[PDB]
Amino acid sequence: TYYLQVRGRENFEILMKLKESLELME
Amino acid sequence: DTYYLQVRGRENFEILMKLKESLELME
Amino acid sequence: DTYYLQVRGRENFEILMKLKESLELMELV
Amino acid sequence: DEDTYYLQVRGRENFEILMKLKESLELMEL
Amino acid sequence: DTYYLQVRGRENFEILMKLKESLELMEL
Amino acid sequence: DTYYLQVRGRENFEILMKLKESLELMEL
């Protein structure tokens, strides 16, 4: 498990969705 | 205007939902 | 096996269409 | 730090992709 | 101004072109 | 083989550079 620091709630939510997306693709 | 994006496969449907949500957060 | 994603606005519709095609190309590598 | 978050990421591949994507996002937002 | 991005593999080239299409639309 | 993608704008050049790296990471 890794931890990516994200400043800003906007980019946090988007990066969450992008992570979930990468998982779906894999 | 409301559009409907055709998508083949459950996997990509779910991804595009997340990408659509991400666009809306940016806009 | 076919799904439909409602999208508000032609601009996002067009963006998502290209993003879908990117996904499909990546998945075919 | 009230608006600073830590995204929990399973596996090193996705972690490194997400760092690139994060930087991409920040570039688009400037 | 015009830039050139080095890409290895024609498949990845086509993927990046599609991603570039997306990026330009998002920026309008 | 090596190709060169033409990109208008420094912004998209740097982004697409990051996207290329991401592609290569997924393909490893």
Swiss-Prot record, chain D:
Phosphorylation by PLK1 and PLK3 inhibits the transcription regulator activity and pro-apoptotic function. Higher levels of phosphorylation seen in the brain from patients with Huntington disease. It comes from the Eukaryota. Expressed in striatal neurons of patients with Huntington disease (at protein level). Brain, kidney, placenta, colon, heart, liver, spleen, skeletal muscle, prostate, thymus and pancreas. Highly expressed in fetal tissue. Expressed in the respiratory epithelium. It is found in: Nucleus; Cytoplasm. Residues 1-30 are annotated as: Interaction with HIPK2. Induction: Not induced by DNA damage. Isoforms lacking the transactivation domain block gene induction. Residues 1-30 are annotated as: Oligomerization. Possesses an acidic transactivation domain, a central DNA binding domain and a C-terminal oligomerization domain that binds to the ABL1 tyrosine kinase SH3 domain. Found in a complex with p53/TP53 and CABLES1. The C-terminal oligomerization domain binds to the ABL1 tyrosine kinase SH3 domain. Interacts with HECW2. Isoform Beta interacts homotypically and with p53/TP53, whereas isoform Alpha does not. Isoform Gamma interacts homotypically and with all p73 isoforms. Isoform Delta interacts with isoform Gamma, isoform Alpha, and homotypically. Isoforms Alpha and Beta interact with HIPK2. Isoform Alpha interacts with RANBP9. Isoform Beta interacts with WWOX. Interacts (via SAM domain) with FBXO45 (via B30.2/SPRY domain). (Microbial infection) Interacts with Epstein-Barr virus protein EBNA6; this interaction inhibits TP73-mediated apoptotic pathway. It is linked to Ciliary dyskinesia, primary, 47, and lissencephaly: A form of primary ciliary dyskinesia, a disorder characterized by abnormalities of motile cilia. Respiratory infections leading to chronic inflammation and bronchiectasis are recurrent, due to defects in the respiratory cilia. CILD47 is an autosomal recessive form characterized by onset soon after birth or in early childhood. Maps to a chromosome region frequently mutated in diverse cell lines of human cancer. Appears not to be frequently mutated in human cancers, in contrast to p53/TP53. Hemizygosity is observed in neuroblastoma and oligodendroglioma. Belongs to the p53 family. Participates in the apoptotic response to DNA damage. Isoforms containing the transactivation domain are pro-apoptotic, isoforms lacking the domain are anti-apoptotic and block the function of p53 and transactivating p73 isoforms. May be a tumor suppressor protein. Is an activator of FOXJ1 expression. It is an essential factor for the positive regulation of lung ciliated cell differentiation. This is Tumor protein p73. It comes from Homo sapiens. The gene is TP73. The chain holds residues 351 to 380 of 636 of the full protein.
